[PDB]
Amino acid sequence: MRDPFMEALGLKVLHLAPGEAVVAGEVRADHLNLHGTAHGGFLYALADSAFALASNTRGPAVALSCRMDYFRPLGAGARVEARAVEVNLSRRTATYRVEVVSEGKLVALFTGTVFRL
Amino acid sequence: MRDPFMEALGLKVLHLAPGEAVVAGEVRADHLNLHGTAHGGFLYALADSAFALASNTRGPAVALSCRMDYFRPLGAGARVEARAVEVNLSRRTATYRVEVVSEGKLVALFTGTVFRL
Amino acid sequence: MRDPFMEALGLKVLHLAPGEAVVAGEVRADHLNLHGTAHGGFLYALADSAFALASNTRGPAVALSCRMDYFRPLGAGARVEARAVEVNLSRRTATYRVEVVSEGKLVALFTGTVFRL
Amino acid sequence: MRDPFMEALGLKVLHLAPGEAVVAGEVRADHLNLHGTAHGGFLYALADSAFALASNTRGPAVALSCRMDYFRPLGAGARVEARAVEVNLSRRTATYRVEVVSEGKLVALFTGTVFRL
Ligand SMILES: [Cl-]
């Protein structure tokens, strides 16, 4: 398993088991947006990566629809984690909840559904 | 206006006007996922960037909730664009639709709502 | 085609063609919520009905994920329509955009994806 | 507190406390769709009602964006519940997760964000 984008973003896996995964990273200078806070795409990439790993432990799967709800902004240097858990596993689709956490606070909530190939 | 993450991803602005924006990029080797296709986070970052620029033409705004629907995978070298248009503009919130297109095909659809500061 | 819930809500079809549908209704006294405005479930039911009809013109399909963005409240007596159009049609999934309109104003935006049986 | 639509749908409250609520109902003949299963609008109305009650325990609030993920169909006679819990409470917005359950099975997952008036 090699994910070029995860590697480019400096992400690491803290846990991987059937139906679940935790991916972590640190907000670097190149991850900031025009507001000076962690770009929504960086936080989403983090959650999506945990989502991808968790869902693929059940077999090949690709994202269909994902929702990202942002609660708190993060600045450079912030250590963040995306914790993915399985909500539903069906024959051709599956859904996961991914909590994005930093220093014990829920920074964002990701909800995604995949199509099982 | 300087967005470190957009710059790091090699994104460029093709259009910016009141309530709308178009951001473009090319899928590079470092943008691929474990599947060998454009990482969902890269495509989302592209759409989110157009969303951010379009929404901020109305004044400071931050994302609340965003949905990303994926329709077609993209490989390295693909030229992609995210076209953001305003769907609703309220006093404290606004919503935008962002079409992600590559070679005339709709690759994904992004729907997002911001909170106006 | 008989839909008990659509009938119970007093909904009517104003258009049905391949990949698209328009469903209309009027906000009645029994459709109001604790706020005295059209219940979110009534507006969603309206959009979902147009979504269901439009998607099923392509063959049997059931909803996977749907998003409803609310922009303006409606009171009793308001005439409302849900206009569904096809955004993407794939082999096993399809996505539709449904605009909820009343007196020329966009009251809400519904985005939904179905699984094709 | 009187909600005409909840009453019309035969819904009842099983729990209400700060930041949370449980609403229950039974799928009646008039709640079925063209497929002969519980209409998506009925299940959404159920979840939305729990969402509305839970969010309003914190003060007046109206829905901004809601997502409904469907996992299992329900037939006439099914007893269903929507359990709403608070995910995030901010100054002007709040987010809730609502699990739709029937006979111990997760039938659907609702995720919604409100604007606090
Ligand atoms: Cl959504």
Side-chain angles (χ1 to χ4, degrees), chain C residues 2-5 9 29-30 32-35 39-42 44-45 48-49 56 61 63-70, chain D residues 2-5 9 29-30 32-35 39-42 44-45 48-49 56 61 63-70:
Chain C
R2 171 184 165 61
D3 192 298
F5 198 50
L9 294 179
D30 61 307
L32 303 181
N33 55 29
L34 70 173
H35 306 303
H39 193 289
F42 173 73
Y44 179 97
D48 187 65
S49 295
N56 279 268
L64 285 177
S65 183
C66 303
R67 176 184 174 105
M68 183 72 164
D69 291 307
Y70 298 90
Chain D
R2 171 184 165 61
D3 192 298
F5 198 50
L9 294 179
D30 61 307
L32 303 181
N33 55 29
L34 70 173
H35 306 303
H39 193 289
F42 173 73
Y44 179 97
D48 187 65
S49 295
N56 279 268
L64 285 177
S65 183
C66 303
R67 176 184 174 105
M68 183 72 164
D69 291 307
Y70 298 90

Side-chain angles (χ1 to χ4, degrees), chain B residues 31-97:
Chain B
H31 298 155
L32 303 181
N33 55 29
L34 70 173
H35 306 303
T37 63
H39 193 289
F42 173 73
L43 297 179
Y44 179 97
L46 179 71
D48 187 65
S49 295
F51 166 63
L53 290 178
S55 60
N56 279 268
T57 59
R58 304 303 196 186
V62 294
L64 285 177
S65 183
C66 303
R67 176 184 174 105
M68 183 72 164
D69 291 307
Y70 298 90
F71 310 133
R72 312 162 67 75
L74 290 181
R79 289 289 190 176
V80 61
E81 283 174 25
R83 307 165 180 177
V85 300
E86 197 171 77
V87 176
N88 176 78
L89 181 60
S90 291
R91 178 171 173 289
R92 301 312 301 290
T93 57
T95 299
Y96 300 75
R97 160 169 52 260

Side-chain angles (χ1 to χ4, degrees), chain A residues 44 64-66 68-70, chain B residues 3 44 64-66 68-70:
Chain A
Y44 179 97
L64 285 177
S65 183
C66 303
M68 183 72 164
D69 291 307
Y70 298 90
Chain B
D3 192 298
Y44 179 97
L64 285 177
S65 183
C66 303
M68 183 72 164
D69 291 307
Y70 298 90

